[PDB]
Design a protein around this ligand. Structure first.
Ligand SMILES: *C(=O)[C@]1([C@@H](O)[C@@H]2C=CCCC2)NC(=O)[C@@H]2CCO[C@@]21C
Ligand SMILES: *C(=O)[C@]1([C@@H](O)[C@@H]2C=CCCC2)NC(=O)[C@@H]2CCO[C@@]21C
Lengths: 200, 240, 130, 202, 237, 197, 212, 122, 216, 236
């Protein structure tokens, strides 16, 4: 699994692979590792597929309830805090979750890393999964806050592509999302075979 | 004064009037009769039909509490059904713990204690039903017990509950039931039922008969239809 | 149950809690207690209603109780209720000393006891402390 | 431990050894493993001393209450059922092998076995314990139908002595009880009363 | 009166006045008829609401593929009982893989309803029920009263002015056993028409039908679906 | 492993922590704050197991601020430390123990500066200087060598720099930048971060 | 004491434009023995949905009963039958409710969506599910899946027309793939049960596989 | 536990206990609030005993740094409500990481009072 | 139970035209010791249903208690509805699965046989809750030694008579006495037909030991 | 006396006393009107403003249950908050479990199940002591189209075409009888409801003393702003 996210001047970039594995058998090559919590808020999934899906869907329900009660959209920090509090109750019981919560709120862009161990950290650049180490190098050598939108797209695609090249448990396609002030857009879904053709 | 509103209140003369009012509820019901002979027990109920729209077998007042134990009720039918379920549960628990069929005296004592537990508190209401339990076994013989809304259980040779209990008792005292057979007892039960019924006030009725004895191998069951119809013929002949 | 219920914790048509007013009447008839605050100290002075010749002296005082190392109280009203409340005051002070390892401030102790006494005027169907 | 019960026409005969062991040390050498549950109902206890004592006391309590409420002498089957219920419910927690023998007016003399696990079976003779293994062939060869009380007593004593010779966990004295309608008679066999069998010598 | 406020108080006459007051709730409600042939069972319900905009309130409910009920009295109590019956049938299918016999369901209902009548601070269920069912013993019509008493009927009407329907049914009950489905439903509709004030008539709006039988799951015919049955029904006398 | 250090002076307390948040072999964050503000003159520094640190620290913070709201004055450092030890000790034998190592720094108007050390078993000690982590093993002797009770805050910052330089020379972990705060009668002051290029 | 055992079995689902196909083998086994040769692993839920369960048989039976009950409850509460996607989401929550003592069941749902098109949903034992176009599950899933990737998905094929899948070609492919599976997998054999879901309803077919 | 129903309906559709609580409010000290352009003004009536009251620890109370409350009626009830509100404010700071809105705490207090008009034994 | 103590070996079942036949030996083993040699492991549930069990005899006796009480409770109502063999099979499956899910199994393997509405029923339940139906069944070591012969007969001739089925059961019992160490020479045969449930008591098999002289 | 009777006592006429008294409490509230058309559902309520110092924007008589369902309330408005929270939680739980939107009838039924759940004994701690003094109008759009439902304190819920609740219900209901036809457009419904509300209100209808909301197929729940309200008010 390779998931990636970074904040730049024009918003948040989220990218993921699409390979689901059960041992060394490739169960799927079209899995969706990004959950759409609300039109302004996204989450990523790494680790246990069922765990991440269930708990982030539960977060989506709670966030909708918040919006109904308080007549205002929830903040990224509050959503990440809710998820961390929810998963702390099941510590030591074997949950495997690694999540990035991304959005735009009254403080601007936001990106938070939440894992089942208990971490909740804010940051400008994150990568989770088996291939996260390979994505970190490309992202760190290419990342600037003053990137242009197409440059940011290309950097994210390149980092996920290199991770799939080196990691056995990553592959399939690169699914890309751009969080902007008016909401997130689906940018592209590019197969890594076509990216191999483009980059070689 | 309000000395009669709770079952946890005595009156100045030492009476619990709520239990007496429940007994009044029993006296308004139609009459059930039980007769015991050396080899068995016979139960007869006058079952009033309040409309012709009702099927045959509606509002049964005779229950099977155990495969050897039968029950004949009078009063409030819902209370009687709840009590029948209590008795069934008692018999089941006895078989599961001690491993044989419950003696009738023990079952009557347990159910009478359960009934008595409702005559002590303001939080619950007394039962508005009276009932007879009947059984046969080789070891214990033939047993007939009666339980009233206060919780008193007594053994009988012949018992009657309901509206025409006194007239029925007068009729039952005319039988030398100890040296009779269950076949004769069925005809006599039917005859007494037809005697005590008041056609002017109560319109129409069915006769509900059951028995338990060596004739049935200690199993409580409904009297077979041919025996029932023969007994009804005898009863209608006797009334002229 | 409804017939025998005295309904202690309800309102009157004028917004009054009647059992509390009756308990105040009980306190108006007890022995006098006065407290005076000075620059160098503070004092309590009570009148003793146990003035029979055949009474024996034992203990420390009749109406003055020591709650802590730094606090004391005097009571007016029903004596048994006072015994209950003083036991509870001592418990509250020692629980605070266990939690924070400092002696409790006086107003915090008063507030805790008064929360207990407010509880009896709002729910439970029991009589207040006189 | 070696416990035995044999049924004859009109009653039962029970017999046991008298050894309590904590490992290889004999803590009690004259113990009574025959317990009066009721007037004509006895149990032979095998396994954990504490567990069997507790179960026996509980069954004695329950059976006495039952007999007072019913105003009848109890049945042997009822006592066996109470033992079976308790031993099956707490089978994970208890190590208790029981033999229940007795006389009642309805069925006569009866012998029931409740092994570990909590099953209940009626037998014409029952043996139990660790020494019971060594006398299975002997009881199968020697048991005959229609024995009298004296023959049953001799048969039980012979079997128990044979078991005590070969088992390190059995020994001491032989305790016997005969239960019939007329009541209970108890005997102790010690020393030269215990049957002797010649040992092979070269 | 000191005897008429609690369900735990007996009167000196031997009655419980709260249970009678609860039966009054069934007497006030809208009328329903139920009847059975040798193969089918039919429930006919007179739907009505407060105003014409307000759609006629739902009187016939689906309990199981072989059981349906009609309601009279307090609708929330009726939904409580309906949920209880649905759960009992589901548990029977889970454990024994067979449908629950109808008589045993009515026994369970009677057990449920009797408990509140014996305890302080509780009330009866102010609902009268008509149960239509099919099982291995044939078709069944059952009546349930707030007193926890239940009846096995050949036919029955409950509600307001239902005595006239009961009179009609008694007059014609010998025919029902030999009827076909349309004839049986028309008999029920005539009985239900007997309760309406002389000006009112039976329309596709105010009538609901419920049918169960040997080879038919419980069906609720409302609206256009009832037009096949309302056809060929002579005018009132 | 994470590093905490505290130095007590005549009228001040000086605390420093590292700014690294790590997962496996990567540094996920390099500007992490490990200091929690209990009141206007109390700081709590917490390291240990993930999740346990923030949950315990924020529970303590919430209850201390609730004391301020309810009573109109603030807990003293000693009382806050004893409250913390009570809660950690109570949870020690339950099913949800916290694996946290803590330092508590404070200033009291009547008692002066205070530094408190607490391990994960909930033993509470009062110290002139203290440290937590694997780097403590390397820097406690430097504090023993150069600390005097009458030390000024300029000299305290110099001694802190010595300790952090030793960590840069001899420690196997990459701890490149440190957060530095001081507590005095005027409250909590953020000093410059100590960074090594 | 082990609360699980492996009872074998292979299931297959293929989605079409106007059809769905769910197939399974009918052998029930334990260890090296055969329990029965006539135990199908496909169950009808609605007139538009079929489910396929493989794994531990006790869990399969219990889950089938639970799903049927939930469908009846939904129809009581909401007055309509459940859709294929709603069933999939409900099953996901049912599976996650046993997260710390799981159901050892592999589930494939096949049916029609609300536009009348074919839909296949695949689950793992804890409730992660995905919408697919074809899917294999069970003991011979690793044998069956690559062939379906090649023949239905046209993967690794160069200049091959992507003609839409027809019901005839799909039926032939299912039969051939199960014939190949029964050759190499010891848990697969006996008979093949094929259920075809269309707007006209559900239609069943049975073909024979080798009995050794 | 005590499970009597205190607040019940009267024949005219009135909850008499609520009306009597409103009478209790009518007996209390007068509080006036004015909303300004930049300020908010809160004034209360004092019942002052000459020379003998100690007003050193008495404050108009603060729920957080940004919200103030004034009460009329039974003072002990007001103390209970204020402490509950303060606990809720700290919980909101923990769970949302932002200070409360005035309407949020007003909603919490109003729901608490409503809950006490529909509970057994209160 | 976590450790079985007194156990029974294998139970056999065959359906024929007009009913079902079930067979079991009368032995309870305490490890390798043939301890209780006269116990019955077949039960008459009702006039249409019979049951046989292998495994822990105490768990079997508990089940006999519960099932008997359930049948009596149903017969008290007198409403003309009885339990079918299929309903008892489903109840048994639910009971075993519930016990397994609590990690407290009933250590039994059960065969249910019945005849209702002119149709024969034969069903298998295992300790874990695996349940199914088949035309012949065998538990324990009979699954390896007896099921082959029964299956071979049934594949060729799918419908049997009572005589043929009984003969086949006797052959299979002989094979089990030859090759199972926990087996006994006395068995019982239960039959369910339209007349009900009939149990035939201590039966023995005729053995052949001629190969003993071929050892040389 | 007030405590002679329990809360679960029947009248001699067969009605629960507390429910009848709560229904009488319904008659003291503000007037709400709901009209159902093939183009959607319209809900109009009157804000009963007692003082010029009250800010009318804090009076919420119409709430959003979900994007497809809205509610209008009359009576004891504080009691309605529990029911509304239950409705919101039910719709979100349904979306979580089934990945679809709830029907208006199911939401109404779920809320109506809470209505008679009151008592003194044999009830869990945290149970209700009295009924709810609110009438609710639910309006929404589901696969059956635009649906309008009415709920009263007895637990009874019905489906309605046009409906008025509150103090002026009888006269408003008669007017709705006169003006409702099945072929109305949503604009006509809005205008007709405002005409009737103007007729029954004791104040003069301006854009700050009323509330109006619509639910249409495709468009979500919409609360009218002041400007749109003035646009509609101009015609009346
Ligand atoms: C990724 O971490 C990974 C994915 O299968 C999983 C499935 C989809 C959504 C969440 C991410 N989880 C795993 O267990 C395998 C092994 C490592 O990477 C996986 C492919
Ligand atoms: C017998 O089984 C035995 C006895 O100690 C014990 C004594 C009291 C009555 C019950 C039986 N139990 C034991 O554990 C030892 C070891 C073998 O036999 C014992 C002697």
């Amino acid at each position: 699994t390779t998931t990636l996210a970074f904040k730049f001047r024009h918003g948040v970039i989220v990218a993921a692979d699409s390979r689901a594995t059960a041992g060394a058998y490739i169960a799927s090559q079209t899995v969706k590792k990004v959950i759409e919590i609300n039109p302004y808020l996204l989450g990523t999934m790494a680790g246990g597929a069922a765990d991440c899906s269930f708990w982030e869907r539960l977060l989506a329900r709670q966030c909708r309830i918040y919006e109904l009660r308080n007549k205002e959209r929830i903040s990224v920090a509050a959503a990440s805090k809710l998820l961390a509090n929810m998963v702390y109750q099941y510590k030591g019981m074997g949950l495997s979750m690694g999540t990035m919560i991304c959005g735009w709120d009254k403080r601007g862009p936001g990106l938070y890393y939440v894992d089942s161990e208990g971490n909740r950290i804010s940051g400008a650049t994150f990568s989770v999964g088996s291939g996260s180490v390979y994505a970190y190098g490309v992202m760190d050598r290419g990342y600037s806050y003053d990137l242009e939108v197409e440059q940011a797209y290309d950097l994210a695609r390149r980092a996920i592509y290199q991770a799939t090249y080196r990691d056995a448990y990553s592959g399939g396609a690169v699914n890309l999302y751009h969080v902007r002030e008016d909401g997130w857009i689906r940018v592209s879904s590019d197969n890594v075979a076509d990216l191999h053709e483009k980059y070689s | 004064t309000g000395y009669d509103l709770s079952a946890s209140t005595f009156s100045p003369d030492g009476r619990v009037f709520q239990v007496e009012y429940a007994m009044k509820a029993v006296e308004n019901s139609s009459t059930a009769i039980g007769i015991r002979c050396k080899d068995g027990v016979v139960f007869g109920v006058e079952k009033l039909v309040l409309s012709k729209l009702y099927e045959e077998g509606s509002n049964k007042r005779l229950f099977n509490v155990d495969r050897h134990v039968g029950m004949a009720v009078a009063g409030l039918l819902a209370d009687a059904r709840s009590l029948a379920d209590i008795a069934r549960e008692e018999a089941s628990n006895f078989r599961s713990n001690f491993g044989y069929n419950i003696p009738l005296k023990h079952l009557a004592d347990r159910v009478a204690m359960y009934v008595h537990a409702y005559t002590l508190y303001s939080a619950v209401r007394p039962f508005g039903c009276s009932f007879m339990l009947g059984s046969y076994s080789v070891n214990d013989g033939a047993q007939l017990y009666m339980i009233d809304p206060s919780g008193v259980s007594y053994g009988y040779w012949g018992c009657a509950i309901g509206k025409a209990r006194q007239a029925a008792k007068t009729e039952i005292e005319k039988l030398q039931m100890k040296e009779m057979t269950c076949r004769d007892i069925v005809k006599e039960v039917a005859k007494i039922i037809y005697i005590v019924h008041d056609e002017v006030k109560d319109k129409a009725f069915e006769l509900e008969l059951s028995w338990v004895g060596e004739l049935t191998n200690g199993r409580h069951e409904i009297v077979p239809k041919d025996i029932r119809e023969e007994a009804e013929k005898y009863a209608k002949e006797s009334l002229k | 149950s409804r017939r025998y219920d005295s309904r202690t914790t309800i309102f009157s048509p004028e917004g009054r809690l009647y059992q509390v007013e009756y308990a105040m009447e009980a306190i108006g008839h007890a022995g006098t207690c006065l407290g005076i605050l000075a620059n160098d100290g503070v004092l309590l002075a009570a009148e003793r209603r146990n003035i029979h010749k055949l009474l024996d002296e034992v203990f420390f005082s009749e109406k003055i109780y020591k709650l802590n190392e730094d606090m004391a109280c005097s009571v007016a009203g029903i004596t048994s209720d006072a015994n209950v409340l003083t036991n509870e005051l001592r418990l509250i002070a020692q629980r605070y000393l266990l939690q924070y390892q400092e002696p409790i401030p006086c107003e915090q102790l008063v507030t805790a006891l008064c929360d207990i006494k407010q509880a009896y005027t709002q729910f439970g169907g029991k009589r207040p402390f006189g | 431990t070696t416990i035995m019960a044999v049924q004859f026409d009109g009653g039962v005969v029970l017999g046991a050894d008298s050894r309590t062991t904590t490992g290889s040390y004999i803590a009690n050498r004259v113990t009574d493993k025959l317990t009066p549950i009721h007037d004509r109902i006895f149990c032979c206890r095998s396994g954990s001393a504490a567990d069997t004592q507790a179960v026996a006391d509980a069954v004695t309590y329950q059976l006495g209450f039952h007999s007072i409420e019913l105003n009848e002498p109890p049945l042997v089957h009822t006592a066996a059922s109470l033992f079976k219920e308790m031993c099956y419910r707490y089978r994970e927690d208890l190590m208790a092998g029981i033999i229940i023998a007795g006389w009642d007016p309805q069925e006569g003399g009866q012998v029931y076995s409740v092994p570990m696990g909590g099953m209940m079976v009626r037998q014409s003779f029952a043996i139990g314990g660790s020494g019971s293994s060594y006398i299975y062939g002997y009881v199968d060869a020697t048991y005959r139908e229609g024995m009298t009380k004296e023959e049953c007593l001799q048969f039980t004593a012979n079997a128990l002595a044979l078991a005590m010779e070969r088992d390190g966990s059995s020994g001491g004295v032989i305790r016997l009880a005969a239960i019939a309608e007329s009541g209970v008679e108890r005997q102790v066999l010690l020393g030269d009363q215990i049957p002797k069998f010649a040992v092979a010598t070269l | 009166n000191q005897y008429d406020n609690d369900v735990t108080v007996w009167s000196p006459q031997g009655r419980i006045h709260q249970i009678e007051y609860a039966m009054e709730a069934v007497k006030q409600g809208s009328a329903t008829v139920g009847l059975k042939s040798k193969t089918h069972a039919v429930l006919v319900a007179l739907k009505r609401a407060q105003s014409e905009l307000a759609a006629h309130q739902k009187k016939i409910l689906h309990v199981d593929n072989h059981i349906g009920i009609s309601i009279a009295g307090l609708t929330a109590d009726a939904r409580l009982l309906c949920n209880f019956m649905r759960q009992e049938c589901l548990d029977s299918r889970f454990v024994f893989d067979r449908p629950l016999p109808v008589s045993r369901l009515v026994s369970l209902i009677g057990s449920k309803t009797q408990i509140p009548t014996q305890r302080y601070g509780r009330r009866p269920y102010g609902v009268g029920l008509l149960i239509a069912g099919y099982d291995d013993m044939g078709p069944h019509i059952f009546q349930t009263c707030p007193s926890a008493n239940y009846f096995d009927c050949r036919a029955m009407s409950i509600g307001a002015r239902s005595q006239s329907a009961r009179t009609y049914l008694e007059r014609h009950m010998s025919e029902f056993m030999e009827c076909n489905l349309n004839e049986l439903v028309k008999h029920g509709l005539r009985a239900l028409r007997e309760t309406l004030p002389a000006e009112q008539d039976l329309t596709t709006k105010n009538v609901s039908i419920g049918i169960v039988g040997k080879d038919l799951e419980f069906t609720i015919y409302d609206d256009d679906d009832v037009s096949p049955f309302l056809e060929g029904l002579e005018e009132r006398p | 492993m994470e590093y905490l250090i505290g130095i007590q002076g005549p009228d001040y307390v000086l605390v420093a922590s590292d700014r690294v948040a790590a997962s496996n072999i990567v540094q996920m964050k390099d500007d992490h704050d490990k200091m929690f503000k209990m009141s206007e003159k109390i700081l709590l520094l917490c390291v240990g197991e993930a999740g346990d640190t923030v949950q315990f620290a924020e529970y303590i913070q919430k209850n201390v601020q609730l004391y301020k709201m309810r009573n109109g004055y603030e807990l003293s450092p000693t009382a806050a430390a004893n409250f913390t030890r009570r809660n950690l000790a109570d949870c020690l034998r339950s099913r949800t123990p916290y694996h946290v190592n803590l330092l508590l720094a404070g200033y009291d108007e009547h008692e002066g500066p205070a530094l408190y050390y607490m391990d994960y078993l909930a033993a509470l000690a009062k110290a002139p200087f203290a440290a937590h982590g694997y780097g403590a093993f390397l820097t406690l002797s430097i504090l023993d060598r150069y600390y005097t009770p009458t030390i000024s805050r300029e000299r305290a910052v110099e001694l802190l720099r010595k300790c952090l330089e030793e960590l840069q020379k001899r420690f196997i972990l990459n701890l490149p930048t440190f957060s530095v705060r001081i507590i005095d009668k005027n409250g909590i002051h953020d000093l410059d971060n100590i960074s090594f290029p | 004491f082990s609360p699980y055992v492996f009872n074998g079995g292979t299931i297959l689902a293929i989605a079409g434009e106007d059809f769905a196909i769910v197939a399974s083998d009918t052998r029930l086994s334990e260890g090296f023995s055969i329990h029965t040769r006539d135990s199908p692993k496909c169950y009808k839920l609605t007139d538009k949905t079929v489910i396929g369960c493989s794994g531990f048989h006790g869990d399969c039976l219990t889950l089938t009963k639970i799903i049927e009950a939930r469908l009846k409850m939904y129809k009581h509460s909401n007055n309509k039958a459940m859709t294929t996607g709603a069933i999939a989401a409900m099953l996901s929550t049912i599976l996650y409710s046993r997260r710390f003592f799981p159901y050892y069941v592999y589930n494939i749902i096949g049916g029609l969506d609300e536009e009348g098109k074919g839909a296949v949903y695949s689950f793992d034992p804890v409730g992660s599910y995905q919408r697919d176009s074809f899917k294999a599950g069970g003991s011979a899933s690793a044998m069956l899946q690559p062939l379906l990737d090649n023949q239905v998905g046209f993967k690794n094929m160069q200049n091959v027309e992507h003609v839409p899948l027809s019901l005839d070609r799909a039926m032939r492919l299912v039969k051939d793939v199960f014939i190949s599976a029964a050759e190499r997998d010891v848990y697969t054999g006996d008979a093949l049960r094929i259920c075809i879901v269309t707007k006209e309803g559900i239609r069943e077919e049975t073909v024979s596989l080798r009995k050794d | 536990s005590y499970d009597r129903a205190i607040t019940v309906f009267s024949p005219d559709g009135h909850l008499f206990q609520v009306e009597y609580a409103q009478e209790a409010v009518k007996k209390g000290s007068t509080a006036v609030g004015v909303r300004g352009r930049d300020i908010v003004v809160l004034g209360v009536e004092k019942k002052s005993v000459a020379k003998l009251q100690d007003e050193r620890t008495v404050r108009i109370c603060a729920l957080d740094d940004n919200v103030c409350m004034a009460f009329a009626g039974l003072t002990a009830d007001a103390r209970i409500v204020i402490n509950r509100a303060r606990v809720e404010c700290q919980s909101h700071r923990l769970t949302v990481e932002d200070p409360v809105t005035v309407e949020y705490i007003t909603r919490y207090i109003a729901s608490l009072k409503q809950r006490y008009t529909q509970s057994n034994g209160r | 139970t976590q450790n079985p103590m007194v156990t029974g070996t294998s139970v056999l079942g065959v359906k024929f035209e007009g009913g079902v036949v079930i067979a079991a030996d009368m032995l309870g083993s305490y490890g390798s010791l043939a301890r209780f040699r006269n116990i019955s492991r077949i039960m008459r549930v009702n006039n249409s249903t019979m049951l046989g069990a292998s495994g822990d005899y105490a768990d079997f006796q508990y089940l006999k208690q519960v099932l008997g009480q359930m049948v009596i409770d149903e017969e008290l109502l007198g409403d003309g509805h009885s339990y079918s063999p299929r309903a008892i099979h489903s109840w048994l499956t639910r009971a075993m699965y519930s016990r397994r899910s609590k990690m407290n199994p009933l250590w039994n393997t059960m065969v249910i046989g019945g005849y209702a509405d002119g149709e024969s029923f034969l069903g298998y339940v295992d300790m874990l809750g695996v349940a199914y139906e088949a035309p012949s069944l065998a538990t324990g070591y009979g699954a390896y030694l007896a099921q082959p012969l029964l299956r071979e007969v049934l594949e060729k001739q799918p419908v049997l008579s009572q005589t043929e089925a009984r003969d086949l059961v006797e052959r299979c019992m002989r094979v089990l006495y030859y090759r199972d160490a926990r087996s006994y020479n006395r068995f019982q045969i239960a039959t369910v037909t339209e007349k009900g449930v009939e149990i035939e008591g201590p039966l023995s098999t005729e053995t052949n030991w001629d190969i003993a002289h071929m050892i040389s | 006396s007030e405590y002679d009777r329990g809360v679960n006592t029947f009248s001699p006429e067969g009605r629960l006393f507390q429910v009848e008294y709560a229904i009488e409490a319904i008659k003291l509230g503000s007037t709400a009107i709901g009209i159902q058309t093939s183009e959607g559902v319209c809900l109009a309520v009157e804000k009963r403003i007692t003082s010029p110092l009250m800010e009318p924007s804090s009076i919420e008589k119409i709430v959003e249950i979900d994007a497809h369902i809205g509610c209008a309330m009359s009576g004891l408005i504080a009691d309605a908050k529990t029911l509304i929270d239950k409705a919101r939680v039910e719709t979100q739980n349904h979306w979580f479990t089934y990945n679809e939107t709830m029907t208006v009838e199911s939401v109404t039924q779920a809320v109506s199940n809470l209505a008679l759940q009151f008592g003194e004994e044999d009830a869990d701690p945290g149970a209700m002591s009295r009924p709810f003094g609110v009438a609710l109008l639910f309006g929404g759009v589901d696969e059956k189209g635009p649906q309008l439902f009415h709920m009263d304190p007895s637990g009874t819920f019905v489906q309605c075409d046009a409906r008025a609740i509150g103090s002026a219900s009888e006269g408003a209901q008669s007017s709705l009888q006169e003006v409702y036809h099945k072929s109305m457009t949503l604009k006509e419904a809005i205008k007709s409801s405002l005409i009737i509300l103007k007729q029954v209100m004791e104040e003069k209808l301006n854009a700050t003393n009323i509330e109006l909301a619509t639910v249409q197929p495709g468009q979500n729940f919409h609360m009218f702003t002041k400007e749109e309200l003035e646009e509609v008010i101009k015609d009346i």
